Amino acid sequence: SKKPPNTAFRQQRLKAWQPILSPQSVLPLLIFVACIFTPIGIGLIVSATKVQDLTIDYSHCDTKASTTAFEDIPKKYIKYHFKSKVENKPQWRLTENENGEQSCELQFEIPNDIKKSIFIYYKITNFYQNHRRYVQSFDTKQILGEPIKKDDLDTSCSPIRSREDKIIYPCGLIANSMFNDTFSQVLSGIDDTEDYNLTNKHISWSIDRHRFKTTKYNASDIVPPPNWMKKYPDGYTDENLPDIHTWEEFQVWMRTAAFPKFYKLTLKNESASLPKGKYQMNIELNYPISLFGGTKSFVLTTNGAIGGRNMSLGVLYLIVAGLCALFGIIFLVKLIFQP
Amino acid sequence: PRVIHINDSLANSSFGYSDNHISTTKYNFATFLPKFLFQEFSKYANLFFLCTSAIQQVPHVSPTNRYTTIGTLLVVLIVSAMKECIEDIKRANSDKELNNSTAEIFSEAHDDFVEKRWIDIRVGDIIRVKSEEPIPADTIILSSSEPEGLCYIETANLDGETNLKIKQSRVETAKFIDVKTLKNMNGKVVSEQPNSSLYTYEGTMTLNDRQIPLSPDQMILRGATLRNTAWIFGLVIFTGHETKLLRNATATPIKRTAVEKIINRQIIALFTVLIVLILISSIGNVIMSTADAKHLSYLYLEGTNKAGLFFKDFLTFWILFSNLVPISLFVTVELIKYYQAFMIGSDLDLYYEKTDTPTVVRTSSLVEELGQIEYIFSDKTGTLTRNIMEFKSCSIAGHCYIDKIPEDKTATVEDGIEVGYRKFDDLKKKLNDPSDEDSPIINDFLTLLATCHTVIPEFQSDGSIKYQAASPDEGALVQGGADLGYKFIIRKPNSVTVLLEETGEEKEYQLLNICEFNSTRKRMSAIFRFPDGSIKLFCKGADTVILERLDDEANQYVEATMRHLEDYASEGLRTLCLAMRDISEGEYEEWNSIYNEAATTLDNRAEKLDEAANLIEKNLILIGATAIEDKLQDGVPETIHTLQEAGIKIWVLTGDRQETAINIGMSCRLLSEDMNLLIINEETRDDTERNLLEKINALNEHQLSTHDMNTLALVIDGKSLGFALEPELEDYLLTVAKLCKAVICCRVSPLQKALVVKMVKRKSSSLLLAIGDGANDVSMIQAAHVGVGISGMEGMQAARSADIAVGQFKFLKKLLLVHGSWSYQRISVAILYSFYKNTALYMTQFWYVFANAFSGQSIMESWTMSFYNLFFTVWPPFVIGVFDQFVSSRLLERYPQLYKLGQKGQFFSVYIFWGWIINGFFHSAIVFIGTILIYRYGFALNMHGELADHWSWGVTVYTTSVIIVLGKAALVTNQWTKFTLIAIPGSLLFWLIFFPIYASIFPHANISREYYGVVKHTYGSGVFWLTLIVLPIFALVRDFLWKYYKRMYEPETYHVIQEMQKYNVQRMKKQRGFAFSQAEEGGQEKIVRMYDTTQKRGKYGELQDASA
Ligand SMILES: CCCCC/C=C\C/C=C\C/C=C\C/C=C\CCCC(=O)O[C@H](COC(=O)CCCCCCCCCCCCCCCCC)COP(=O)(O)O[C@@H]1[C@H](O)[C@@H](O)[C@H](OP(=O)(O)O)[C@@H](O)[C@H]1O
Ligand SMILES: *[C@@H]1O[C@H](CO)[C@@H](O[C@@H]2O[C@H](CO)[C@@H](O[C@@H]3O[C@H](CO)[C@@H](O)[C@H](O[C@@H]4O[C@H](CO)[C@@H](O)[C@H](O)[C@@H]4O)[C@@H]3O)[C@H](O)[C@H]2NC(C)=O)[C@H](O)[C@H]1NC(C)=O
Ligand SMILES: *[C@@H]1O[C@H](CO)[C@@H](O[C@@H]2O[C@H](CO)[C@@H](O)[C@H](O)[C@H]2NC(C)=O)[C@H](O)[C@H]1NC(C)=O
Ligand SMILES: *[C@@H]1O[C@H](CO)[C@@H](O)[C@H](O)[C@H]1NC(C)=O
Ligand SMILES: [Mg+2]
Missing domain, CATH: 3.40.1110.10 (Calcium-transporting ATPase, cytoplasmic domain N)
Structure with a gap:
């Protein structure tokens, strides 16, 4: 009665199939992946060179600029790509205000209109956003708006949770080290070029807006973080407590990027197209560079189907379609010349 | 001395003798868990992961979650324990069949022989054994049916002897044959202790105030069966484990196999890579903390010492890289070797019908030495001959x-x-x-x-x-x-x-x-x-x-x-x-x-x-x-010719005399004509010394060919074997034995059938099988690597403690060639794969620390790395492990020379293990470096200008590194059943459905707090689907072409077989063999006189008077 059954699974005679690596089978698979990849590996380079950007490195603007009039930026600070050729190099000057706060105006000429939407990012280099003491170091509860007391705070915001028995309100190394540099909302058009209004609405992630609510703290218990004292010198007042639900540029800072070089969104304009001409940008130089030792910048790219001028996806489809078409000919040589 | 009161059910339990309870399970229930920890700590991986989870519990050091590596240890702890409980049940009820067997037992209350099992046989009971019925325990006969109270026992389990021995009861108690007049037994049994000397015994039994001396003549033993006599009247002396036969044989020991002895020399080659990859990275953290102290002001680093932040980051890189050792290796090597031992024990060509006994694999860890057998140590009677x-x-x-x-x-x-x-x-x-x-x-x-x-x-x-x-x-x-x-x-x-x-x-x-x-x-x-x-x-x-x-x-x-x-x-x-x-x-x-x-x-x-x-x-x-x-048994001369084509050297170790083991060797075609023997049967050690010295000298002086190596055989006997097993001539005994084809050893004691096995085990490196039946070679089964038992109708105490139990000898061809050389290839890929799946992923942690300033940030989420061993890539080790036949069952038995692949170990060594680790590095420096040229600034997505964060990039590394590791398993497998499509291209469809459920449902419940919106920003993005297309194909073009170039331009010996599957000193000349199985003490001349068969049977059973 212990006789095992005669099922086709138990006797390991299951209905099976075998891979025959044979040069009438593998060789028409090397042309299956060298004639569907090259029309994609070309179809992406044609959509990563139709992206028109303009990179201005405004990093050392306080040192090497005259307050008097414009000059040219050195070539080692500007990268730019367009359909047509530029007629003048862009221009730039430093402007110190009456209070003693600087400002770095930038003037550039755009050689043709761009029908798509226009985005403004600021590129930061050598800023280790993905450090282990930096990504996890912010409190989750205070972003949602729960009035957390001191003892039930997170230990992840460990150096800056409290200064004088007080709740540092957006605790964490992320919110303490926020990029201050405001960007002027309008590309002001010079030499009778029409000015261009950019907005900062909807620049964050759409799921960050549901998570970033205003705070239910009482204002007598919360101090600013120690790198926000030039904006709130007295402390957090009851009237201008920051509404982080509508503070968009704080939301795109807490979405921590993955490399020491990254873009961050700060401005966009969807409904219209800017025309050809010379324009002007105004940036206040609040964030120093000796804090991290890198280069803050300013880019004006247009969003393509795979991103900016990023030839890496078009090229990685062609090193495959190269090696899957090179060894599609070393088959027919090593077969025929040496069977 | 041990004293027994006859006719007493109470007072004989006071002396604390053992019971008939035998235990074949490697432990009992009470000693389960503290014996179980030595079993878990002898693996070096599970030894390592307990310390790592203790290291995770110092605060603020873990890059992952604080409970992830104790969370995947308790699964490994439990599943390797639930295997052990069902290997306890399966060896409980198979032990129960010996415990439940019947025996007529005297009970003084009934005054009749009642039906009770073998368990309740106390020492001191009076039992009755019918014809062709095995004796339950070592006993002393009182009276019997035959004239002058004698009987005949077949000692085919006690030794290799084919003939029957006479055991005559003493003449004083010849009259007490009546079950009604049995009730006047009065006296003691003064015996000797358990001595484990088979053919010697002493004891003095007194009855009705009159002593009676005993002898080994008046004693029958446990494994012997009673033949050619109606009944006997026994008084039990030993039992259980304290018998004269089953005291030296212990329980089933932990036998470390020949693959696990290469894993523990592979893991030591992975602690080198783990220690180097801490002292490359954590040395670099010391450098960048001090050299860039100006430019890291936003982190608020302490900078107290160079040896405090070293040790506060020696453990972070210890924890992040501790998944280089795969924790799901020592469970998915148990649950392949358990599910292979269930597939072996269900094959109809390994199932003997006439007895209705399927093959059964008790010790399921020794399944993969069946492809690496280089010696077979058989037995002659019960195994080779049919005893007829x-x-x-x-x-x-x-x-x-x-x-x-x-x-x-x-x-x-x-x-x-x-x-x-x-x-x-x-x-x-x-x-x-x-x-x-x-x-x-x-x-x-x-x-x-x-x-x-x-x-x-x-x-x-x-x-x-x-x-x-x-x-x-x-x-x-x-x-x-x-x-x-x-x-x-x-x-x-x-x-x-x-x-x-x-x-x-x-x-x-x-x-x-x-x-x-x-x-x-x-x-x-x-x-x-x-x-x-x-x-x-x-x-x-x-x-x-x-x-x-x-x-x-x-x-x-x-x-x-x-x-x-x-x-x-x-x-x-x-x-x-x-x-x-x-x-x-x-x-x-x-x-x-x-x-x-x-x-x-x-x-x-x-x-x-x-x-x-x-x-x-x-x-x-x-x-x-x-x-x-x-x-001879069925298929024996056809098996031994096939087992000698595969290079295995058969060694016969009988218990029989020399003149008939040669004759069996002539009929099974072990021996042949035109093959001179080298017989060493000499008396004293010097006479073995010269005859050892003469044989080695006569054939080391000249080169003899392999055709002349087949023309030679060795025959030795047990009297001459104890003088060639002393440690001064063990090297000589190999040098004559390593040239001859077949080796027969005769009259070999039950100990020396292990001391030959324990000598070739510690002299060469070759594995060796032992096969037999009966309890004379139960010590041989515990000494060899694989011990096969043959379950007979009588005895089968060998088939209790054997690792594999088989029906007869002729199934050894299909077991060792088909089911042995499958079970060596089927585990030597599902281990080399399970060392590779935990390196094509968990190296992108290490290639990440050249970014992020030598800190140790985990590139992926904490739980999604702990779902990698357990859910998505645990199935392709199973399907490769149990459902992959590299050459079919018809072709392995057709060409027996293919077994020389498994002997030399051409599938599993460190020089081929490093080909899978380095292939696990190069597969991880493409899913990384291919995904920093894409997502260069986070600017990859086209969703109204938003960007990809740290967590919508880590998923693109994880999802690409799953569809490479599954895609590699689709290239290393050989045969695509309906169970391969479920695992290898189906676990990809598992992850691409389980992840959007994991990204929308589980973050709301305060677990896996990140990727709160990534399923929008990966699956909807056109870059995530064009990364999954070519980043596998870029990293499998090396595999898809070197697999092609190996099949044609440098093919191995089995590839052409795979391509075949889809399309197509005494000389023997003047020796006149004499073999008469009769020996002295068969009672030859006394037995002819006191018989008749015309006289009808007596009243009380088969009592017959001595009519001489
Ligand atoms: C860090 C400290 C630790 C250092 C440790 C390093 C080295 C250890 C020291 C010595 C190593 C010792 C020996 C290593 C040398 C040779 C190994 C022996 C050769 C060897 O058989 O292996 C091969 C790997 O082939 C590579 O070679 C693999 C080729 C890939 C090599 C590319 C090198 C990448 C190096 C890392 C790149 C880093 C990039 C930079 C990233 C960092 C960014 C800053 C095995 O795979 P295989 O596909 O052929 O397997 C085959 C095949 O799969 C199958 O089709 C066949 O069976 P069947 O036909 O029946 O199906 C059968 O032939 C089977 O064998
Ligand atoms: C743009 O963002 C910049 C970095 O986030 C930030 O620059 C830092 O600003 C802080 C605050 O203004 C500076 O901290 C100062 O530290 C010096 C000593 O080094 C002090 O003058 C003073 O500290 C004092 O400390 C006392 C006890 O510790 C305390 O009681 C006082 O209240 C007082 O805080 C300043 O706080 C820091 O040096 C700046 N530079 C760097 C490189 O960190 C800018 O403020 C910010 N700008 C705007 C407009 O937001
Ligand atoms: C995007 O840019 C266009 C300019 O090309 C903006 O359109 C102008 O919006 C301002 C708002 O103050 C009006 O005064 C102008 O008359 C508009 N120009 C035209 C030609 O209609 C548009 O509003 C911008 N989108 C935003 C800010 O969301
Ligand atoms: C458009 O630009 C002008 C020029 O600075 C500005 O005054 C006006 O407020 C802008 N419109 C909006 C809606 O911001
Ligand atoms: Mg036998």
């Missing part, structure tokens, strides 16, 4: 007669001597015809088959007769003889009869005298009295003793029969000469006194009776010679 002799042919007057004639052999023309065969009924035609010359010889021959022996017949309920023989050779002489006519029936104390069935009359034969068989005599003779009054002498014996006693001028067939005895033993048959002489009435009268003058004497009788026979057997004439053959 039948009469094959006979030769008289130079004419041979056989029932079925082979087609190569026929009575041809003589070349000076007539050879060939005839049918048996033609022997009757020369017998019935009174004109022929040989008719007095045939009549003097066919009664010599029927009279001269010592078999005792017993009628059945049917008129068919059943012959009860002391030695099973002459039990085949009569039964084969009665087919020729002259059927032997009723035996009397003075005479025998014989019924000529063609005439129907029965001729009396007054047995006058009969001599017994001995070791050095090699013959036995029986002097008879015919019904005519002309008395007669008969004789049967060996060639080298019968040739020195002739009347040379009388017989002329002597050269004709010696040619036939070189013919018979060449085919593998046990031969026997048959010669007589005519004796007058006066020449008996002078000698029969002199025989009786050697009979009235007491103390020189053992050395004077054999002298007393030599005066009368001087002048003999020759009738002819017969040849009984031993039934």
Whole structure:
């Protein structure tokens, strides 16, 4: 009665199939992946060179600029790509205000209109956003708006949770080290070029807006973080407590990027197209560079189907379609010349 | 000394003797868990991960979650424990079949033999054992059915002996045969202790205030079965584990296999890579913390010391890289080796129908040495032979007669001597015809088959007769003889009869005298009295003793029969000469006194009776010679030829004598003709020394070819084996044994069948199998690597403690070639894959620390790395492990030379293990470096200008690194069943459905707080789907082409077989084998007298008086 059954699974005679690596089978698979990849590996380079950007490195603007009039930026600070050729190099000057706060105006000429939407990012280099003491170091509860007391705070915001028995309100190394540099909302058009209004609405992630609510703290218990004292010198007042639900540029800072070089969104304009001409940008130089030792910048790219001028996806489809078409000919040589 | 009170159920339990409870399971229930920790800590991986989870519990150090690596340890802890409980159940009920077996037991309350199992047999009970029933424990007989209270036990489990021994009860207690008059037993049993000496025993039993001495003659043992006797009356002495047979054999030890001895030298080669990749990265954290102290002000680093932040980041890189060792390796190597042992024990070509016994794999860890066997240490009786002799042919007057004639052999023309065969009924035609010359010889021959022996017949309920023989050779002489006519029936104390069935009359034969068989005599003779009054002498014996006693001028067939005895033993048959002489009435009268003058004497009788026979057997004439053959089991000569083509060297280790293990070796084609032996059977150690020195010297001086290596064999015996197993000549014994084809060892004790195994285990590096049955070689099964048992109808104490239990010998071909060389390739990929899946992913943590300033941020989420071993990539180790046949079952048995792949270990070594680790680096430096050229600033997505964060990039590394590791498993597998499509391209569809459920549902419940919106920002993005297309294909172009280039331009030996599957010193020449299974103490001469079979059965059972 212990006789095992005669099922086709138990006797390991299951209905099976075998891979025959044979040069009438593998060789028409090397042309299956060298004639569907090259029309994609070309179809992406044609959509990563139709992206028109303009990179201005405004990093050392306080040192090497005259307050008097414009000059040219050195070539080692500007990268730019367009359909047509530029007629003048862009221009730039430093402007110190009456209070003693600087400002770095930038003037550039755009050689043709761009029908798509226009985005403004600021590129930061050598800023280790993905450090282990930096990504996890912010409190989750205070972003949602729960009035957390001191003892039930997170230990992840460990150096800056409290200064004088007080709740540092957006605790964490992320919110303490926020990029201050405001960007002027309008590309002001010079030499009778029409000015261009950019907005900062909807620049964050759409799921960050549901998570970033205003705070239910009482204002007598919360101090600013120690790198926000030039904006709130007295402390957090009851009237201008920051509404982080509508503070968009704080939301795109807490979405921590993955490399020491990254873009961050700060401005966009969807409904219209800017025309050809010379324009002007105004940036206040609040964030120093000796804090991290890198280069803050300013880019004006247009969003393509795979991103900016990023030839890496078009090229990685062609090193495959190269090696899957090179060894599609070393088959027919090593077969025929040496069977 | 141990004392036993007869007729007492209470007081005998006070001395604390053991019970019949045997335990074949490697532990019991009570010692489960603290023995289990040594089992978990002997693996070096599970030893390592307990320390790592303790290291995770110092605060603020873990880059992952704080409980992830104790969370994937308790799964590994539990699943390797639930395997152990079902390997406890399966070895509980299989042990229960011996515990539940029946035994008639005296109970004083009932005063009758009642039905109870074997368990409740206390030491001191009185039991009763019927015919053909195994004795439950070591006992002392009291009285029995046979006259003078004797019996016959078959010791085929106690040793390799084929014959039956006489165990006569003492004459004082011969009267107590009544179950009603049993109730007056009064006395003690003063015995010896458990001694584990089989053939020696002492003890003194007192009864009714009168002592009785005992002997090993009055003792029968545990594994022996009772044969040719109605019942016996036993008083149990030992039991359980304290028997004389089962005390030295322990429980099933932990046998570390030959793959796990390479894993623990592979993991040490991975702690090197783990320690180097801490002291490359964590040294770099010391450098960048001090060299960039100006530019890291936003982190608020302490900078207290160079040895505090070293050790605060020695553990972070310890924890992040501790998944380089795969924790799901030592469970998915248990649950493949358990699910392979369930697939072996369900094959119909490994299932014996006649007994209805499927094969069963008890120890399921030793499944992969079945592809690396290099020696086989068999057993002769029970394993090779079927323990059944039948009469094959006979030769008289130079004419041979056989029932079925082979087609190569026929009575041809003589070349000076007539050879060939005839049918048996033609022997009757020369017998019935009174004109022929040989008719007095045939009549003097066919009664010599029927009279001269010592078999005792017993009628059945049917008129068919059943012959009860002391030695099973002459039990085949009569039964084969009665087919020729002259059927032997009723035996009397003075005479025998014989019924000529063609005439129907029965001729009396007054047995006058009969001599017994001995070791050095090699013959036995029986002097008879015919019904005519002309008395007669008969004789049967060996060639080298019968040739020195002739009347040379009388017989002329002597050269004709010696040619036939070189013919018979060449085919593998046990031969026997048959010669007589005519004796007058006066020449008996002078000698029969002199025989009786050697009979009235007491103390020189053992050395004077054999002298007393030599005066009368001087002048003999020759009738002819017969040849009984031993039934080898089915498929034995076809298996051993296949097992020697695969390079395995068969070693036979019997318990039998030397003269018949050679004859078995001739019939199974281990031996052959034109193959000289190297026999070493010498007395003292110096006589083994010279004969060891002479054999090595005679063949190391000259090179002998491999054709001349097959022409040599070794035969040694156990008296000469203990002098070649002392540690000064063990090296010599290999050097003669490493050149000969087959090695036979004879009369080998139960200990020395392990001390040969424990000698070749510690002299070479080759694995070796042991196969057998019965408890004489239960010590051999615990000493070899794979110990196969053969489950017999009696005994099978070997099949208890064996790792694999099989039905018979002929399944060893399919087990070792098909199911052995599969189970070595099927685990040597599902381990080299499970070392590779945890390196194509968990290296992108290490190639990340060249970014992020040597800190240790985990590139992926904490739980999604702990779902990698357990959910998505645990199935392709299973399907590769159990459902992948690299060459099919028809082709491995067709070409037995393919087993030399598994012997040398061409599938699993460190020099091929490093080819899978380095292939796990290069597969991780493409899913990383291919995904920093894409997502160069986070600017990859086209969703209204938003960007990809740290967590919508880590998923693109994880999802690409799953669809490479699954895509590699689709290239290393060989055969695509319906169970491969479920695992390898189906676990991809598992992850691409389980992840959007994990990204929308589980973050809301405060677990896996990140990727709160990534499923929008990966799956909807056009870059995530064009990364999954080419980043696998870029990293499998190396695999898809070197697999192609290996099949054609540098093919191995099995690839052309895979392509075949889809489309298509004594010399043996002058040796005349003598093998008579009778030995001394078969009670040869006492047993002929005190019998009858015409006297009807007694009242109380089968009581028969001694009618002598
Ligand atoms: C860090 C400290 C630790 C250092 C440790 C390093 C080295 C250890 C020291 C010595 C190593 C010792 C020996 C290593 C040398 C040789 C190994 C023996 C050769 C060897 O058989 O392996 C091969 C790997 O082939 C590579 O070679 C694999 C080729 C890939 C090599 C590319 C090198 C990448 C190096 C890392 C790149 C880093 C990039 C930079 C990233 C950092 C960014 C800053 C095995 O795979 P295989 O596909 O052929 O397997 C085959 C095949 O799969 C199958 O089709 C065949 O069976 P079937 O036909 O029946 O199906 C059968 O032939 C089977 O064998
Ligand atoms: C743009 O973002 C910049 C970095 O986030 C930030 O620059 C830092 O600003 C803080 C605050 O203004 C500076 O901290 C100062 O530290 C110096 C000593 O090094 C002090 O003058 C003073 O510390 C004082 O400390 C006392 C006890 O510790 C405390 O009681 C006082 O209240 C007082 O805080 C300043 O706090 C820091 O040096 C700046 N540079 C760097 C490289 O960190 C800018 O403020 C910010 N700008 C705007 C407009 O937001
Ligand atoms: C995007 O840019 C266009 C300019 O090309 C903006 O359109 C102008 O919006 C301002 C708002 O103050 C009006 O005063 C102008 O008359 C508009 N120009 C035209 C030609 O209609 C548009 O509003 C911008 N989108 C935003 C800010 O969301
Ligand atoms: C458009 O640009 C002008 C020029 O600075 C500015 O005054 C006006 O407020 C802008 N409109 C909006 C809606 O911001
Ligand atoms: Mg045996």
